[model samples]
Target: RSPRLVGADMPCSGRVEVKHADTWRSVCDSDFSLHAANVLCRELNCGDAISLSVGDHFGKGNGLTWAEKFQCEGSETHLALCPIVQHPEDTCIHSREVGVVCST
Candidate 1:
């Protein structure tokens, strides 16, 4: 499934979430990186990366979590192009759901 950015009115910047097994889940802010945001921006047609954030800058998420840690190279056109790895002991609260602001 495709990754989604939620809450922001612009639709390009918001809580970062991913769908897995037909379920939507929030990505941990700590699990995301600037390189990751670059691809997300490209995929959303949101231009360059304005900023990558955490702590629910858009708003606290309401979905379940654990989308794995993405390792992007800042050159991919799709977020899916990034590689992913699971955390050793993963569990981030909604308060830590990833938030990103992409240029529009």
Candidate 2:
């Protein structure tokens, strides 16, 4: 559960909204991808995670909760080896916010 989706409890979906460029948007399943999931699981010390479920699948996020999709290298070794769909150019900077699920 920790790896699938981690965020502070929220009273509603609006709570999971993220503020970007003076605006806020709800993070849909699409926003959460494999690359992002790896960052979260790896940075947070979570075990090899299979899938990332959102909402009550585990817990709801209030005031900026986030999720990601992941593709491990079958060895569950490190997040870097996993296949990534996010634009490669941003992968390096993205790693910095591993535990913090931020998407663009």
Candidate 3:
């Protein structure tokens, strides 16, 4: 499934999560960056990203932490299309979760 930005009032902003094994989980900022955020915003059709956030700026996530690092080319059509480091063992901490705002 595709990734989405949630927990915020606007469609162009919020926490980032990817669908994994039928459950949606948050991404850690361990390696997340503006490069990745750019792809995410475009994937969501939210245009370019205005800012990238970490340390749970939007709020903590309750479900499993699915990804640790997402290495994007800053031009991917979809986040899932990028090289992602999966954490099937849930080794991620809540404070490292990533959030973003787009320039829609």
Q: lDDT tens string, model 3, 2-70?
A: 778888889889999878778988888766779888988898889999998878988878788765567
TM-score of each: 0.89, 0.35, 0.85
lDDT of 1 by residue, 4-103 (tens): 8899988888888777778888888778889988888888888888998878889887868774777888898887788888854857788988888898
Q: Rate the local accuracy (lDDT) of all candidates.
A: 0.81, 0.38, 0.81
Q: Which candidate has the highest TM-score of all? A: 1
Candidate 3 local Cα displacement, residue 23, angstroms: 0.8
Error of 3 at 95 (Å): 2.4
- Name the runs in model 3 displaced over 4 angstroms: 86-90
For each of the candidates, the C-alpha root-mean-square deviation to the true structure, in angstroms, is 1.5, 10.8, 2.5
Name the lDDT value of residue 83 in candidate 1. 86
Kindly report which residue pairs in candidate 2 clash with one another.
10-62, 15-63, 33-69, 34-69, 34-70
